[PDB]
Amino acid sequence: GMQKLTILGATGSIGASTLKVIEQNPDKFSVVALAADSNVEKMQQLCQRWQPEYAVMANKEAALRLKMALAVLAPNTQVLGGQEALCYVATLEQVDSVMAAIVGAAGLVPTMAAVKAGKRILLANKEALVMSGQLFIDEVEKSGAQLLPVDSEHNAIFQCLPQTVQGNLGRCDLASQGVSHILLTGSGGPFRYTDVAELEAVTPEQAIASMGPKISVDSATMMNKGLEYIEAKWLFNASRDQLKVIIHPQSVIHSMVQYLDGSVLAQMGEPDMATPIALTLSYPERVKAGVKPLDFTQVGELTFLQPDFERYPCLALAIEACYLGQHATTTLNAANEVAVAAFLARQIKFTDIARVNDSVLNQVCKQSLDSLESLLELDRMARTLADEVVRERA
Amino acid sequence: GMQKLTILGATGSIGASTLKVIEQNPDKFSVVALAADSNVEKMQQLCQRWQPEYAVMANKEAALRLKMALAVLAPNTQVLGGQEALCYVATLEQVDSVMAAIVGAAGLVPTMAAVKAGKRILLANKEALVMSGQLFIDEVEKSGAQLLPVDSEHNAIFQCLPQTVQGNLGRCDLASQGVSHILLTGSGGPFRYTDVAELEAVTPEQAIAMGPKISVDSATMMNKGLEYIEAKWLFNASRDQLKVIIHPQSVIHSMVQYLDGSVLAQMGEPDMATPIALTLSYPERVKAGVKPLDFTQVGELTFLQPDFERYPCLALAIEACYLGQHATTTLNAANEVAVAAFLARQIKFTDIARVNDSVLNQVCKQSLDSLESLLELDRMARTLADEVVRERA
Ligand SMILES: NC(=[NH2+])NCCC[C@H](N)C(=O)O
Ligand SMILES: [Cl-]
Numbered sequence: 076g077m078q079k080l081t082i083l084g085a086t087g088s089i090g091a092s093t094l095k096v097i098e099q100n101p102d103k104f105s106v107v108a109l110a111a112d113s114n115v116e117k118m119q120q121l122c123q124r125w126q127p128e129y130a131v132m133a134n135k136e137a138a139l140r141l142k143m144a145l146a147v148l149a150p151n152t153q154v155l156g157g158q159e160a161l162c163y164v165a166t167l168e169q170v171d172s173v174m175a176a177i178v179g180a181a182g183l184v185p186t187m188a189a190v191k192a193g194k195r196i197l198l199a200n201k202e203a204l205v206m207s208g209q210l211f212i213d214e215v216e217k218s219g220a221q222l223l224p225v226d227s228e229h230n231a232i233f234q235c236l237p238q239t240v241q242g243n244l245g246r247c248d249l250a251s252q253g254v255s256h257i258l259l260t261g262s263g264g265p266f267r268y269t270d271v272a273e274l275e276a277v278t279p280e281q282a283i284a285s286m287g288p289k290i291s292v293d294s295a296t297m298m299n300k301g302l303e304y305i306e307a308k309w310l311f312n313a314s315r316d317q318l319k320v321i322i323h324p325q326s327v328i329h330s331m332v333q334y335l336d337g338s339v340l341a342q343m344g345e346p347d348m349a350t351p352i353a354l355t356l357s358y359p360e361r362v363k364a365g366v367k368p369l370d371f372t373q374v375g376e377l378t379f380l381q382p383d384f385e386r387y388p389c390l391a392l393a394i395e396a397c398y399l400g401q402h403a404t405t406t407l408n409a410a411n412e413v414a415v416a417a418f419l420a421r422q423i424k425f426t427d428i429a430r431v432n433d434s435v436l437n438q439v440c441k442q443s444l445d446s447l448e449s450l451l452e453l454d455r456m457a458r459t460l461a462d463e464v465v466r467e468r469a
Numbered sequence: 470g471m472q473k474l475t476i477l478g479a480t481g482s483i484g485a486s487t488l489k490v491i492e493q494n495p496d497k498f499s500v501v502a503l504a505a506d507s508n509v510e511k512m513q514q515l516c517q518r519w520q521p522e523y524a525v526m527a528n529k530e531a532a533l534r535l536k537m538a539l540a541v542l543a544p545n546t547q548v549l550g551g552q553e554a555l556c557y558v559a560t561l562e563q564v565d566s567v568m569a570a571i572v573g574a575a576g577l578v579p580t581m582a583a584v585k586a587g588k589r590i591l592l593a594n595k596e597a598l599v600m601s602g603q604l605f606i607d608e609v610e611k612s613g614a615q616l617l618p619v620d621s622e623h624n625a626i627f628q629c630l631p632q633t634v635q636g637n638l639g640r641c642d643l644a645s646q647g648v649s650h651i652l653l654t655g656s657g658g659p660f661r662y663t664d665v666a667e668l669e670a671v672t673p674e675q676a677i678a679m680g681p682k683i684s685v686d687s688a689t690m691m692n693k694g695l696e697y698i699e700a701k702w703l704f705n706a707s708r709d710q711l712k713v714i715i716h717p718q719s720v721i722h723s724m725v726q727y728l729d730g731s732v733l734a735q736m737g738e739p740d741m742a743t744p745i746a747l748t749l750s751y752p753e754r755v756k757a758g759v760k761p762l763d764f765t766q767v768g769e770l771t772f773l774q775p776d777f778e779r780y781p782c783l784a785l786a787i788e789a790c791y792l793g794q795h796a797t798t799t800l801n802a803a804n805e806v807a808v809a810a811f812l813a814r815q816i817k818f819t820d821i822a823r824v825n826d827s828v829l830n831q832v833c834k835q836s837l838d839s840l841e842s843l844l845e846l847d848r849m850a851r852t853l854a855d856e857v858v859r860e861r862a
Contacts, residue, residue, distance in 0.1 A: 234731060237752075238632050253754025255761055321764050331736070336750070337743040337759030338628060339736040343724070350730040357729070359631075361647025366730030368649060371714055377770035 078356065079107045081129075081164045083185055084176030085121055086114040088286075089199050089225065092348040093174050094121070096356060099363045104356060108164035110185075112177055115140050122149040129153050129167075131160045133181065161185040166192040172356065175200050176225070180454065183207065183447055193218040197355040199225035205302050206405045206450050208309035212245040223355040224310055228303050230351030231329035231342035232257055232311065238359070245312050250335075256317045258331040258339075259307055261300040263322040263380060271385045277425035279418065292415045296428055297382065301393020305404050308397050315398055320390065322380040327369075344369055388429035392436060403440050405450050406457040410435035413461035423468045434464045472749065475502040475523075475558045477579055478570030480511040483593050483619065486741040487568050488515070490749060493756045498749060502558035504579075506571070507531040509538070516543040523547050523561075525554045527575065555579040560586040566749065569594050570619070574847060577601065577840050587612040591748040593619035599695050600798045600843050602702035606639040617748040618703055622696050624744035625722035625735035626651055626704065632752070638703055643710050650710045652724040652732075653700055657715040657773060658688040665778045671818040673811065685808045686782075689821055690775065694786020698797050701790055708791065713783065715773040720762075737762055781822035785829060796833050798843050799850040803828035806854035816861045827857045 080097070084090050090111075097104040106125050111118045112133035122130050122145055130145065130152050132138035138156025145152050155163065158181075165173050165185045173189040175182060176199035186200050191214060198204075203211050215222050222244050224230050233241060236254065240247045249257075265284040266274060279288070282295040293299040300320060307318060321331075331341040344350050345366055353364035384391045389411070396403040414431035417423045423431070435457055474491070478484050484505075491498040502523035505512045509531050516524050516539055524539065524546050526532035532550025539546050549557065559567050559579045567583040569576060570593040580597050583590055585608060592598075597605050609616055616638050618624050627635060630648065634641045643651075659678040660668060673681070676688040686692040693713055700711055714724075724734040737743050738759055746757035777784045782804070789796040807824035810816045816824070828850055 234733060258764070328734075333761045335754050336746040336757040337737045337740060337761065338747065338754075339762050340628060341721075341734045341736055343732040343734055344730045347730060353729040354731065361728045361731075364729040368726045368730065369732050371652075371772040372774060374772055379764040379767055381765050 076103075078104050078171045079169050080104060080172050080174060080356075081108040081110065081167065081170050081189075082106065082174045082176070083110045083161065083165060083182070084112065084174070084178070084199070085109040086111045086117040087176060087178075089174070089176040089348060089352070092352050093176070093197075093356075094125070095349050095365050096353045096362065099365050103362065107167060107170055110161055110164055110177070112181060115144070119144040119148055122152050127152055129155060129164050131155045131164050133158065133161060133177070158184060162188040165189040165194070171195055172197060174225075174352075175203070178202075180206070180451060187211070187214065187447060190214045190220045191218055193220050195221045195223065197223050197225050197352070201226075201302055201306065202408070204306040204309045205408050206454065207401060207445070207447060208305070208404070209401055210445060210447070210450075212309055216246065222310070223358055224306075225348075225352055225355055226303065226306070227348070227351055228259055228261070228330045229307060229310055230354060232259070232307065232332060234342045234354065235330065235332035235340040236311070240311070241358075244310055247312060249311065249313060249317050253335045254317065255333045255335050256319050257307060257311060257313055258333060259300065259304060259318065259320050260323040260326075260328055260330045261297065261303075261320065262294075262324050262326050263382070264295040264297060266295055266386065267322065267324055267380070269386075271383070274386070275424055275426045279421070282418075282425060288419060289412070289415055292418060292428070293411070295425075296389040297387040298389040298393060298411055298428075298432075301390045301396075302408065304390075304393055305397045315394070320382055322382050323377065324380070325375065325377055327374055327377055389432060392429065392432050396436060399440055401445055401450065402453060403436065405453050406439045407432055407436050409454040409457035410461040413458050413465065417465045417469075422465060427468045431461055431464045431468065435460045470497070471499050472497060473499055473501045473563050473565045474568060474749075475504065475561065475564050475566075475583075476500065476568045476570070477504045477555065477559060477576070478568070478572065478593070479503040479515055480505040480508040481570060481572075483568070483570040483741060483745070486745050487570070487591075487749075488519070489758050490742050490746045490755065493758050497755065501561060501564055504555055504558055504571070506575075509534050513538040513542065516546050521546055523549060523558050525549045525558050527552065527555060527571070552578060556582040559583040559588070565589055566591055568619075568745075569597070572596075574600070574844060577844075581605070581608065581840060584608045584614045585612050587614050589615040589617065591617050591619050591745070595620070595695055595699065596801070598699040598702045599801050600847065601794060601838070601840060602698070602797070603794055604838060604840070604843075606702055609639060616703070617751055618699075619741075619745055619748055620696070620699070621741070621744055622653055622655070622723045623700060623703055624747060626653070626700065626725060628735045628747065629723065629725035629733040630704070634704070635751070639705050641705060643704065643706060647728045648710065649726045649728050650712050651700060651704060651706055652726060653693065653696060653711065653713050654716040654719075654721055654723045655690060655693040655696075655713070656687065656717050656719050657775070658690065660688055660779065661715060661717055661773065663779075665776070668779070669817055669819050673814070676811075676818060681812060682805070682808050685811060685821070686804070688818070689782040690780040691782040691786060691804055691821075691825075694783050694789075695801065697783075697786055698790045713775060715775050716770070717773065718768065718770055720767055720770055782825060785822065785825050789829060792833060794838055794843065795846060796829065798846050799832045800825055800829050802847040802850035803854040806851050806858065810858045810862075816858060820861045824854055824857045824861065828853045
């Protein structure tokens with residue numbers, strides 16, 4: 076009856092939220108392995124509290140430091156280091172679910188290893204579907220793995236869909252289950268009400284407005300929503316007709332689904348990742364998450380805007396890239412990482428982010444079976460091109 | 470494949486919405502019988518268009534006029550009259566579903582007959598659960614009938630609940646399916662922002678701002694009180710599991726709060742074809758002739774907390790709910806009389822609650838129910854309400 080978990084990415088906020096849910100439900104969930112790619116100090120404190128069978132650092136030098144610490148703080152925890160070790164804890168025979176919350180391309184291989192092992196995948200890595208969506212959906216079908224999305228918007232959509240679609244992510248025909256379209260919602264970022272002409276003079280200070288700066292700039296360009304759009308396409312097998320973006324500045328509603336009869340289902344809640352995580356752990360049942368019920372006294376007004384592509388050119392690029400396929404979305408994601416770093420380094424203007432993305436995307440896709448290796452190679456090629464366009468713009 | 474329907478109450482707006490959905494889906498639904506009260510002109514036009522096997526008027530004189538009209542225009546339609554005939558078309562062997570949209574206490578007996586026949590019941594009669602909830606839920610269990618609520622709020626709640634609950638209405642333990650509570654929403658009516666002191670002087674013109682009884686009930690929030698009582702019986706909700714929220718714009722139709730912090734809400738254009746369509750198609754979905762919700766034109770959504778100084782009727786309904794069938798039957802009956810008196814300008818708007826309150830107290834100080842015995846109680850309560858209306862006048 077007990078569900079056994081490996082947590083990939085235990086020292087971040089997703090890891091923390093996952094552990095809070097497990098803390099509320101000690102009779103249902105048990106932590107077999109914890110793994111991290113940063114923060115040995117946090118990791119040793121978590122291994123002390125959780126005493127897991129395995130603890131893994133992605134970096135081998137960091138694993139050595141952890142092993143020395145846990146010789147005192149968690150003597151029965153076996154510490155391991157490296158990429159092979161991440162795959163090892165992700166594929167253990169006794170493990171039922173894997174929280175895949177290591178970010179970036181470093182998360183692909185261990186997430187993929189869990190997929191090939193037929194595990195239940197609590198998906199909190201954007202790159203798996205942005206870079207290699209077709210590949211991931213195929214491997215999931217091949218092994219019988221269950222995919223359950225962690226991210227707020229995707230999780231909300233998941234909850235607003237019928238059970239037949241929930242059980243068969245990536246392979247169901249939406250129109251045959253009565254779905255007209257999915258409404259992906261977003262706040263619109265700090266420049267939601269800013270005149271388009273003023274965007275040229277925007278500074279990194281303004282674009283940050285609390286989480287990491289790359290994620291904040293993506294929120295300002297709505298590239299964050301673009302990437303979510305791409306993931307939604309693969310998660311829910313949605314065509315461009317079936318997938319819409321709506322700006323909802325207050326973020327109380329997390330996303331919605333429009334049905335054929337006129338009915339709309341929406342998911343709402345307090346802004347706490349423990350809620351969506353809790354469902355990924357408990358599906359199809361539900362568990363206490365340590366999150367209070369929504370307080371309609373404090374919600375204030377809910378409003379909606381149509382995104383303007385003059386304001387959010389990156390969003391148009393992501394939608395376009397989406398339906399061109401893996402090569403285009405890998406290219407766009409790579410280019411954007413370079414373009415954002417250049418804006419933050421004050422080499423290019425805020426509005427140049429979209430121009431860099433647009434140039435690189437056009438160059439790559441005018442040319443004519445994919446693997447994780449070949450797509451990483453393409454990621455690298457796109458970065459090189461983006462570096463060159465950054466110089467043109469500087 | 471084809472679902473066969475009897476429509477009780479075909480000439481009203483619910484009947485019209487049902488027929489619009491059937492019109493969109495001729496490969497899935499077929500009309501076996503249509504039934505109505507005494508709008509013979511609308512009924513003959515519908516029997517012309519639909520050519521059903523049976524057509525029934527509740528009034529026998531009206532049935533005779535219809536029978537003469539249809540003898541050429543709908544030659545294959547057998548016309549019948551009276552209460553027994555309503556029960557007959559509601560219980561036909563070939564019929565799968567019954568739209569129970571005859572309103573008031575007259576709807577109880579034929580709706581109940583459909584229930585005892587084990588039919589799928591598309592419930593659009595408030596009285597079945599307000600007056601005789603215990604009795605209906607028991608009879609539904611006994612026969613294996615499916616109950617699917619037509620009314621907007623209940624239908625919304627139904628859609629926001631898990632599938633395991635949807636398949637067992639009136640008998641599922643909500644907490645065991647992860648539900649903390651149901652959030653029954655309402656507009657708050659035309660006086661949502663009005664000072665309590667000003668309610669004494671409101672006139673029927675102001676209370677109407679859609680039949681007039683339903684509008685006044687919307688102004689007092691008795692509408693929400695009645696819906697509260699029905700929800701309790703439909704979803705088997707305890708006093709912890711059922712809440713009321715004011716949402717003035719009525720875009721959100723109701724919501725459900727789950728154990729993990731997640732809330733599901735149902736929204737849509739204000740068109741009864743949507744909820745009706747789901748009652749017909751469940752667990753699948755069908756085209757309903759309703760456009761998708763346009764979020765560019767929705768405007769702002771807000772929420773308020775009801776005040777019992779502003780909505781005394783809502784407190785009465787909740788109170789009556791947990792006192793049982795006798796109390797809810799009494800309150801409903803009293804309120805029908807009290808609203809008619811307000812509309813006739815015999816009593817003040819704020820006297821509606823006072824009449825309801827007096828009658829409810831009088832009846833429940835005194836001490837196996839049937840439809841007959843509860844109808845008698847309905848009549849006794851009306852008599853008392855008439856007397857309190859004179860005191861107030
Ligand atoms: N977190 C990191 N940047 N790790 C890089 C180190 C790679 C690791 N030592 C290995 O050989 O598998
Ligand atoms: Cl967002």
